[PDB]
Amino acid sequence: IWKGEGAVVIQDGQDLKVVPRRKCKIIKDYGR
Amino acid sequence: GFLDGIEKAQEEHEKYHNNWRAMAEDFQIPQVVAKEIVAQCPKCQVK
Amino acid sequence: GFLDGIEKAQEEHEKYHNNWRAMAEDFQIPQVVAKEIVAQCPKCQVKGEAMHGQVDASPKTWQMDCTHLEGKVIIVAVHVASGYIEAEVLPAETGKETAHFLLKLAARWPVKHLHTDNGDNFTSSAVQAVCWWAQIEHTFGVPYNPQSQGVVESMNHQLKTIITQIRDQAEKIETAVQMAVLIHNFKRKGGIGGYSAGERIIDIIASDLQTTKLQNQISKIQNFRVYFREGRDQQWKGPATLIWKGEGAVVIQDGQDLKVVPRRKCKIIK
Amino acid sequence: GFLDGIEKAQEEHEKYHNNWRAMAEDFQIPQVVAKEIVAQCPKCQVKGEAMHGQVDASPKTWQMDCTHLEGKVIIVAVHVASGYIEAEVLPAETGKETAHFLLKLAARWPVKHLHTDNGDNFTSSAVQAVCWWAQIEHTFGVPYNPQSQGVVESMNHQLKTIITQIRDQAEKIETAVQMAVLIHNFKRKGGIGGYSAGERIIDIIASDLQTTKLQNQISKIQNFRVYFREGRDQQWKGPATLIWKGEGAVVIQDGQDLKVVPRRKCKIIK
Amino acid sequence: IIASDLQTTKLQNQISKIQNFRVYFREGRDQQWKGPATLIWKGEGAVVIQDGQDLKVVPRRKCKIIKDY
Amino acid sequence: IWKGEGAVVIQDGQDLKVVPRRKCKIIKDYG
Amino acid sequence: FLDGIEKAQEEHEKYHNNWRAMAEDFQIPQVVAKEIVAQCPKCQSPKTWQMDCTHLEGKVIIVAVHVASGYIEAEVLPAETGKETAHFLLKLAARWPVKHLHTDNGDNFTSSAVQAVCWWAQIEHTFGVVESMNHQLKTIITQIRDQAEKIETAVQMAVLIHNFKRKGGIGGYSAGERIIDIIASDLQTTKLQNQISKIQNFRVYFREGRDQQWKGPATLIWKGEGAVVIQDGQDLKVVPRRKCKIIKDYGR
DNA sequence: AACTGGTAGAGATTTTTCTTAGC
DNA sequence: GCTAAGAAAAATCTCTACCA
DNA sequence: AACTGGTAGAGATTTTTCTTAGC
DNA sequence: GCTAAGAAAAATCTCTACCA
Ligand SMILES: C[C@@H]1CCO[C@H]2Cn3cc(C(=O)NCc4ccc(F)cc4F)c(=O)c(O)c3C(=O)N12
Ligand SMILES: C[C@@H]1CCO[C@H]2Cn3cc(C(=O)NCc4ccc(F)cc4F)c(=O)c(O)c3C(=O)N12
Ligand SMILES: [Cl-]
Ligand SMILES: [Cl-]
Ligand SMILES: [Mg+2]
Ligand SMILES: [Mg+2]
Ligand SMILES: [Mg+2]
Ligand SMILES: [Mg+2]
Ligand SMILES: [Zn+2]
Ligand SMILES: [Zn+2]
Ligand SMILES: [Zn+2]
Ligand SMILES: [Zn+2]
C-alpha cells in the first residue's frame, strides 16, 4: 500500500499492518 | 513499427502459449508488452 | 492490463494527435509504446535535430558571394583561414565579369578550392572554363541554405558597417569600397594571434611552405622500420615508417595514413 | 614616452577609424587611452549590450495579439502564467470587435492586467471604455519591439502548426481554429508540473485563493512584536510584525515590506 | 539443407537490421516537410537521401531520421 | 609533430592526437 | 648558458654573425643575440614598389612591380588620365602594404588625384627593372596570345604564368614565395622590436656574492624563471633571481 | 557515397601588477 | 629589510545582431 | 521615473529498475 | 540466501526554428 523509507504498510486478510523494511522483500506481480 | 507485432503476438499466444522472451525475440516487441501478453492469459504464469 | 489502452490510444491519436506524455498519462501505457505511436504518424514529424556543422578551413580555400549597395553590385571573395577580403564593383551580374574577377584573383594569390552558392553567374560556362584553365576545384552549396558560406556573408555585414563609417570621405562608391577594404585588411586587429588579416594570411602561407620543406628534408633520410599489432583481431600488418618515438606512444605512417600506437604493441627493426 | 603617440593615434583614428587593439599595438600607448580614443567617437558606437529581459508573469496577466491565416484575421489571447489560449476569428480588424472580444474574455475569466502592442485597434476609445468599465490595467509595449510580448507570438506559432495538422478534418476555418484551441488546451501535456494548460490555470487560480484565505486566518490572531537593528548606521526602527521564527533568521513585516533579519540583530517583545 | 537455410536467415536478419531507416526532410524555396525516403550516406553535417530515384543532399539540421526498434 | 596530407598529429597537454587537415590552423605566432 | 653567451660574443667578435644564426647555434634567446648585434660598433626594402605604363595593340597597360622579389601586378586602363591611375594605386595600396612608391615624371603620375590618394594612404612618392619586366611580360603575352579572345584575359594569364610558373634564382623559387618570405621576415623583426622595448623599460639592483651591498642599476635584458641577464658597463652578466630586485624606471 | 554557420564587440568576473603602510 | 593590504590595469569568458 | 523573449521537441548522457548467473 | 554484472527503461540537460 505504501512504501516508506523505513516502514512498509501491507494489506493481508482485511488487515493493515506496518512491517519494517529489513524484514520485507518486494517483488513484481503479474496477476491480471 | 511493432503494433502489428503486438497483434500477431496476441494471436500466436492464443494458439501456442509461448513464453515472453521467445515472443520478444521473434516479433521484435519490447519486453514489457510481451510480459503483459503472458500476464493476461489465465493459464500461463510468467517465469 | 493495458492492451485495450494501446488500442484506445491509437484511435485517440488518430483523431486528436496527442503527444506521448498525454497518452502515457491518460491511458497508463509505458512510454516506449506511446513514443512508438507518435513516431509512426506522418502528419507529425515536423522538427530538425538541433545541431550545426563546420565548414572547410583548408589553407587554400576561398569563398565568393555577391551583394547590393545603393543600387550597385559588389562581389566579395574571402580567404577563409585568415579572413582576407578582396572586393570589386561590377557593372552587371553576368558570368563574364565573374570569370574576369576570378581570373584576376587566381593570378594574384594561390587558389586551389572555391566555394559558392547556386547563383546564375557562378554556374556558367565562362567560370567553368576559367576554373579548368587555372585548375581550381569548384564546389557549390546545398540550395537555399546560406549557412554553408557563413564567412562571406559575415564579411558582407562587416564591409557594409565600415562603408557606413567612412562614407562622407569619398565622392563615388568605388572609392569607398576600396577604402573599406584597406581599413578592414590593415587597420583592424584582434583574433587568433592578435593579427590583422594581412599579417595572418602572410603567416599562414609562409608557415605552410616552410613546414613542407622541413619535413621533406627530415623524411628523406629516415630509417627504423616498425611492425605493429592492432585491430580487433591480433594480426600483423606490413612495413610502416616510424615518425616520432615518444614516452607513451609512437607515431607511424602506413599506406599514407598516420596512426598513434601504444608502446606495448609495436616492435622496432633497424 | 608616448604623448606624441597619443596625438598621432588621435589623427590616425580621425582618418581610418581603427579599433583599440590596433592603436595600442602600433603606437605603444596603454589600453585605457586607446579605449578612450575609440569611446569619444560618434561615427563608431554601433552595438547593443547583449542581454535579455524578463516579462511579467503575475497570476492575472493576459497578453493579446492578432495574426493572419488564409486571408482571415485571428485574434489570440494568452494567460501568461499557465499558457491558456482563447482565440477567435474576426470579420474585420477594427476596434469594436476587439472591444467585444475583450468584454467576453473579461466576463469569463478574472482579468486585472492586459498587455498589447501598439496596433491601431488596441489603441482605441472602445477598448479604453471597456477597460474602464471592467477595471483593467492596459499597458503597451515599446514600439517595433516584438520581444516584449513573447508568449503570444510563440502561441501564434504553435496554433498555426496545430491548424496545419488537423486541416483536412474541417470544412471552414472557424471550425479548424476552435478544434486547434481544444487540442492545445486539453490534449498536450508537459511543462512545469506535467500538466496541460487547463489543469495548470485551474491549479494556479485555486492555489492563489486558498493561500490568501489561509494567511488571513493566520495573521488575524498574531502577536510577538519584534524590534530589529539594521542599516548602514546602527539605528532602531519601529514596531514590526513577526511572521516566521526559524533556525538562523527571522522574517519580519514592516511598512508592508517583507525583510529577513539574522537572529543576532533582533529582539522579541510579547 | 535446413542448417544452411538457418544461417542464411540469420545473416539476412542482420543485414536487414543494419540500415532500415526513414528520413523526413525539408527542402526547396518554400521550406515544406516532405514524405519518407531512404538514407544512403550519413556524414557529419549533411545526409544523402534517395527519393523517387532522385538523389538529394539535405543538411542534418533540416531532416529527421527515424530508426527501427 | 607531423603534418600529413589529410591528417595532422599534434601534442596537447602531453596527449598525442590526430585531427583532420580541415580543422586546423598552423601558424608561428610571433608574439 | 653563460658559456653560450661568452662563445657567442667571441664568435661575433671574429666573424660578425647575424642574430638568427647565433640564436639557432648557441641556444640563446633572440633578444640576447639581438642585443649582442646592437652593441657592435661596426654593425651600425620590403615595401617599395615601382610603377610604369606601356602600350600594347592600342591598349594602355599599367604595370606595378615589387622590386625586392619581382612581383608583377598589371591592369588594362581605358584611358591615361589621373583618376584611373589614382584608382589603380588605391587598389594596390588596399591589397599589399605599400610605403614607398617610385614613378617617372609623366603627366598622369603628377596629378592632384594621385597626390590625394598618396596623402590618404600615407605613401611617399618619388620621381626618378620595370622596363625589363615590361619586356618579359610582352614576350609571355606574345607566347600565349592564341588561347584568348580579348586582351585583358591574355594580360592576366601572362601575370599568372610569370608569378607562379617561372622558377629561378638561388633557391629555385617563384616570385610569390619570395615576396611572402620577405614580408614575413619583416613582420618577425617588428614583433621582436616591440618585445625588446617593453622588456627594456625596467631596472635591476643586484647583490654580488660575499657582500651585503646592492650594486649599480643595470639594465634588464631577459627575465627568466631562475636567471636574469643584465647589461652593465658594456658587459652582459647572468645573475640568479634570488639576488636581484627589479624596479620600474621612469628615465625618458 | 564525400557535406557542414561565423565574426566582432559589450560587459562581468578572475588574474596580475604596482605602490605604500606597518612591524 | 621584509611582508601583506589595496587598488589599478590587463586578460578571459559568456551572449547578442546581422549577413537578400 | 516603473520596462523587459518564449515554447516545445530532438538527441545525448546520466540515473534507476529488473532479471539472472554464480558462490 | 545473498550479491554483483548487465541490459532495459525512465529522467535530465543542451540546442535549434519560428512567431508579419
Ligand atoms: C539567387 C541566389 C541563390 C539562391 O538563394 C538566393 C537568396 N540568397 C539569400 C541570402 C540570404 O538570405 N542571406 C542572409 C542570410 C540569412 C541567414 C544566414 F544564415 C546567412 C545569411 F547570409 C544570401 O545571402 C544569398 O547570397 C542569396 C543568394 O545569393 N541567392
Ligand atoms: C502594426 C503592428 C504594430 C507595430 O509593429 C507591427 C509589425 N509586427 C511585427 C511582428 C513580428 O515581426 N513578429 C515576428 C517576430 C519576430 C521577432 C520576435 F522576437 C518576435 C516576433 F513575433 C509582430 O508579431 C507583430 O504583431 C507586429 C505588429 O503587430 N505590428
Ligand atoms: Cl543557394
Ligand atoms: Cl509595436
Ligand atoms: Mg549569394
Ligand atoms: Mg549571400
Ligand atoms: Mg501585433
Ligand atoms: Mg505579433
Ligand atoms: Zn497462455
Ligand atoms: Zn500524429
Ligand atoms: Zn571612430
Ligand atoms: Zn658586429
CATH of the domain at B2: 1.10.10.200
Q: In what order do the strands lie in the sheet with D84-90?
A: D84-90, D72-79, D61-69, D113-116, D137-140
Helix, strand, or coil (residue C157): helix
Q: CA-CA distance, G29 to D27, in Å (whole number)?
A: 25
Note whether G197 and G249 are within 8 A (CB): no
CA distance D165 to C42: 10
**Cβ–Cβ under 8 Å, residues D139 and D113:** yes
Tell me whether residues G252 and D25 touch, CB distance under 8 A. Answer: no
Annotation-wise, does G16 bind a ligand?
yes
The minimum-distance atom of ligand 2 relative to the CA of D146 is 20
C51 touches strand J (CB under 7 A): no
> Does the Cβ of D191 fall within 6 Å of ligand 2?
no
- Cα distance between residue G66 and residue G49, in whole Å: 5
Containing E55, the helix (H) or strand (E) segment is: strand E54-59
Q: Whose CA is nearest to atom 3 of ligand 2?
A: D119
Residue G134: how many other CB atoms lie within 10 Å: 19
Distance (angstroms) between ligand 6 centre and the Cα of C119 equals: 10
Give me the residues paired with residue D63 across strands. Answer: D78, D115
3-state secondary structure of B20: helix
Domain count, chain E: 1
Q: How far is it, in rounded angstroms, from Cα D81 to Cα G251?
A: 68
User: In this structure, are residues G77 and G88 in contact, taking their beta carbons and an 8 Å threshold?
Assistant: yes
Q: Helices C197-219 and C173-186 sit at what angle, rounded to 10 degrees?
A: 50
Residues forming a β-bridge with D240: D226
Give the containing element (helix H, strand E) for E42. strand E38-42
The number of residues making up chain G comes to 252
State the sign of the Cα–Cα–Cα–Cα dihedral C161, C166, C171, C172.
negative
**Rounded Cα gap, residues D81 and D63, in angstroms:** 11
- Helix G151-164 / helix G175-199 crossing angle, nearest 10 deg: 60
Nearest to C130 by CA among C178, C98, C176: C98
Q: By the 8 A CB rule, do D16 and C183 touch?
A: yes
Q: What angle in degrees, to the nearest 10, is found between the helix axes of G112-121 and G82-95?
A: 20
Does a structural domain hold residue E8? no
CA D52 from centroid of its chain's CA atoms = 11
Cβ-Cβ contacts under 8 Å for G249 (sequence gap 6 or more): G201, G202, G203, G217
Candidates G18, G15, G11; CA nearest to G37 is G18
How would you label A11-23 residue by residue, b for 16+ Cβ within 10 Å and e otherwise?
eeeeeeeeeeeee
CATH number of the domain that C227 lies in? 2.30.30.10
| Grid cell in block for residue B14 | 492464443
- Provide the CB-side half-sphere exposure for G215 (13 A, CA): 16
Scan residues 38-67 of chain C and list those with Cβ within 7 Å of strand H.
Answer: 52-56
- The angle that helices B31-39 and C31-39 make with each other, rounded to 10 degrees, is 110
Q: Judge residue G226's burial from the number of C-beta atoms within 10 Å of its C-beta, 0-12 exposed, 13-18 middle, 19 or more buried.
A: exposed
Residue type, C104: K
C254: Cβ below 6 Å to ligand 1? no
As to burial, measured by CB atoms within 10 angstroms (0-12 exposed, 13-18 middle, 19+ buried), residue E48 is middle
In 3D space, the residue among G102, G94, G99, G97 whose CA is nearest the CA of residue G64 turns out to be: G102
Which residues in chain B are closer than 8 Å to C40, comparing Cβ atoms? Answer: 1, 3
Among A21, G105, D133, G160, smallest CA distance to C109 is for G160
> Going by C-beta distance under 8 Å and a sequence separation of 6 or more, which residues neighbour residue G8?
G22, G25, G26, G28, G33, G36
Greatest Cα pair distance in chain G? 87
* Least distant ligand from the CA of G9: 12
Is E22 part of any domain? yes
G211 is annotated as contributing to ligand binding: no
Which among D68, D75, D153 is the best mutation to test ligand 2's pocket, defined by most ligand atoms within 8 Å of the CB? D153
| Cα(F9)–Cα(C246) distance, integer angstroms | 13
DSSP at B43: S
Which grid coordinates are listed for F26? 598552423
- Does the beta carbon of C149 sit less than 6 angstroms from any atom of ligand 1? no
- List the subunits that have 3+ CB pairs under 8 angstroms with F: C, G
Residues in chain E: 69
The answer to whether some atom of strand J lies closer than 7 Å to the beta carbon of D191 is: yes
Q: Residue E61 gets which letter from DSSP?
A: G
DSSP C17: -
Atom 30 in ligand 1: residue holding the nearest Cα: C119
Distance C122 CA to ligand 3 centre (A): 11
Q: Are strands G59-66 and G71-77 parallel, antiparallel or unpaired?
A: antiparallel
**Separation between Cα atoms, residue C241 and residue C256, nearest integer Å:** 10
CA–centroid distance, D63 to ligand 2, in Å, is 14
* CB atoms near residue D84 (< 10 Å): 22
What's chain G look like in SS3?
CHHHHHHHHHHHHHHCCCHHHHHHHCCCCHHHHHHHHHCCHHHCCCCEEEEEEEEECCEEEEEEEECCCCEEEEEEECCCCHHHHHHHHHHHHHHCCCCEEEECCCCCCCCHHHHHHHHHHCCEEEECCHHHHHHHHHHHHHHCHHHCCCHHHHHHHHHHHHHHCCCECCCCECHHHHHHHHHHHHHHHHHHHHHHHHHCCEEEEEECCCCCCECCCEEEEEECCCEEEEEECCEEEEEEHHHEEEEECCCC
- DSSP state, residue E60: G
Alpha-carbon distance of G20 to G4, in angstroms, equals 14
CATH number for the domain that contains residue G56: 3.30.420.10
CA dist D28 and D34 (Å) reads 10
Q: Dihedral sign, CA of C105, C107, C113, C118?
A: positive
Residues 6+ apart with CB under 8 A from G250: none
Nearest Cα to Cα of residue C144 among E25, D194, D36, D11: E25
- What is the DSSP code (8-state) at residue C223? -
The answer as to whether E5 is a domain residue is no
In a domain, residue E1? The reply is no
State the Cα–Cα distance between residues D86 and G252, nearest whole angstrom.
77
Q: Contact at 8 Å (CB) between D152 and D78?
A: yes
H or E segment to which residue C184 belongs: helix C173-186
Are the Cβ atoms of C103 and G156 closer than 8 angstroms?
Answer: yes
What is the C-alpha separation between D152 and D137, in angstroms, rounded?
18
For residue G46, give the C-alpha cell. Answer: 620590403
Q: Report the protein residue whose CA lies nearest the C1' of nucleotide I8.
A: D32
C101/C168 same-domain check? yes
Q: For D261 and I1, how far is CA from C1' in angstroms?
A: 48
Closest residue to H11 by CA to C1' distance? Answer: D49
Contact C53 E60 (CB under 8 A): yes
CA of G212 to C1' of J8 (A): 76
DSSP letter, residue C91 = S
Q: Solved how?
A: cryo-EM
Which grid cell is G129? 627593372
Q: Which residue's alpha carbon is at the shortest distance from the C1' of K19?
A: D153
**Nucleotide with smallest C1' distance to residue C46 CA:** J9
- Please answer whether residues G153 and C103 qualify as being in contact, where contact means their C-beta atoms are separated by less than 8 angstroms: yes
Cβ contact (<8 Å) for C100 and G153? yes
- Determine whether the interchain pair F16/C211 forms a contact, defined as Cβ–Cβ distance below 8 Å: no
Contact G33, G19 (CB under 8 A): yes
Rounded distance, CA E64 to CA D134, Å?
A: 49
Alpha-carbon span E55 to G154, nearest angstrom: 41
Residue of chain G nearest F27, judged by CA positions = G184
Cα separation, D268 vs D227, whole angstroms: 7
Is G84 labeled as ligand-binding? no
Query: What is the bridge-based pairing of β-strands C72-79 and C61-69?
Result: antiparallel
Give the Cα separation of C183 and C214 in Å (integer). 35
Q: Which ligand is nearest to the CA of G15?
A: 12
SS (H, E, C) chain D: CCHHHHHHHHHHHHHHCCCHHHHHHHCCCCHHHHHHHHHCCCCCCCCCCCCCCCCCCCCCEEEEEEEEECCEEEEEEEECCCCEEEEEEECCCCHHHHHHHHHHHHHHCCCCEEEECCCCCCCCHHHHHHHHHHCCEEEECCCCCCCCCHHHHHHHHHHHHHHHHCHHHCCCHHHHHHHHHHHHHHCCCCCCCCCCHHHHHHHHHHHHHHHHHHHHHHHCCCCCEEEECCCCCCCCCCCEEEEEECCCEEEEEECCEEEEEEHHHEEEEC
Buried b (16+ CB within 10 A) or exposed e, B23-41: bbeebebbebbbbbbbbbe
Residue C170: Cβ within 10 Å count? 16
**Beta-carbon count within 10 A of C181 CB:** 24
Reading the block at residue C95, the C-alpha cell is 558570368
Instruction: Decide if C67 contacts C74 (C-beta within 8 A).
Output: yes
CA separation for the pair C84, C88 (Å, rounded): 14
For residue C137, the one-letter residue type is: E
Strand order in the sheet with G48-56: G71-77, G59-66, G48-56, G100-103, G124-127
Strand H bases near protein CB (under 7 Å) are 1-11, 18-19
Residues D113 and D148 in one domain: yes
The stretches of chain B forming alpha helices (DSSP H) are: 3-16, 20-26, 31-39
Q: Which helix (H) or strand (E) holds C225?
A: strand C225-228
* Ligand 1 contacts CB of residue C65 (under 6 A): yes
Distance G198 CA to I2 C1' (A): 28
E49 within domain boundaries = yes
Inter-chain touch A31–B35, beta carbons under 8 Å: no
Ligand 8 centre distance from Cα of residue D146 (Å): 7
- Separation between Cα atoms, residue A15 and residue C229, nearest integer Å: 70
C-alpha cell at D252: 519580519
Phi, psi (degrees; rounded to nearest 5) at D169: -95, 0
Pocket test for ligand 1, best of C153, C157, C160 (most atoms within 8 A of CB): C153
Alpha-carbon distances of C210 from B33, F20, G181, G184, rounded to whole Å: 66, 20, 9, 12
C3-7 contacts at long range (C-beta below 8 A, 24 or more positions apart): C3/B6, C3/B10, C3/B33, C3/B36, C3/B37, C3/B40, C5/C29, C6/B3, C6/B6, C6/B33, C6/C33, C6/C37
Q: Are residues D138 and D264 in the same domain?
A: no
Q: Angle, to 10 degrees, between the axis of helix C3-16 and the axis of helix B31-39?
A: 130
Residues 6+ apart with CB under 8 A from E5: none
Q: Going by C-beta distance under 8 Å and a sequence separation of 6 or more, which residues neighbour residue D163?
A: D69, D176, D177, D180
Distance in Å from K6's C1' to E60's CA comes to: 33
The answer on whether C131 is annotated among ligand-binding residues is no
Neighbouring C-beta atoms of residue G123, cutoff 10 Å:
19
Whether residue D147 has its Cβ less than 6 Å from ligand 2: yes
Same domain, C164 and C253: no
Q: Determine the distance separating the centroid of ligand 5 and the alpha carbon of C138, expressed in angstroms.
A: 15
Instruction: Kindly state the helix (H) or strand (E) to which residue C9 belongs, with its residue range.
Output: helix C3-16
Question: Is D61 within 8 Å of D136 (Cβ atoms)?
Answer: no
The shortest C-alpha distance from G185 to chain F (Å) reads 10
- Interface contact C39-B10, CB threshold 8 A: no
- Measured CA distances, G251 to C20, E5, G203, G248 (Å): 77, 96, 10, 9
Other C-beta atoms within 10 Å of G242: how many? 8
**CA separation for the pair G234, G40 (Å, rounded):** 10
Evaluate: CB of D144 within 6 angstroms of ligand 2: yes
Rounded distance, CA B12 to CA B25, Å?
A: 13
Which DSSP helix (H) or strand (E) runs through C250?
strand C249-254
Measured CA to CA, the distance from residue G44 to residue C210 in angstroms comes to 30
Judge whether G23 and G31 are in contact, CB under 8 Å: no
C193 lines ligand 1 (CB under 6 A): no
C-beta of D141 in contact with ligand 2 (< 6 A): no
> Range of C67's domain?
61-198
Return the DSSP state at E21. -
Could you tell me the distance in Å between the CA of residue D29 and the C1' of nucleotide I4? 31
CB A12 within 8 A of CB A27: no
Q: C234 with C188, same domain?
A: no
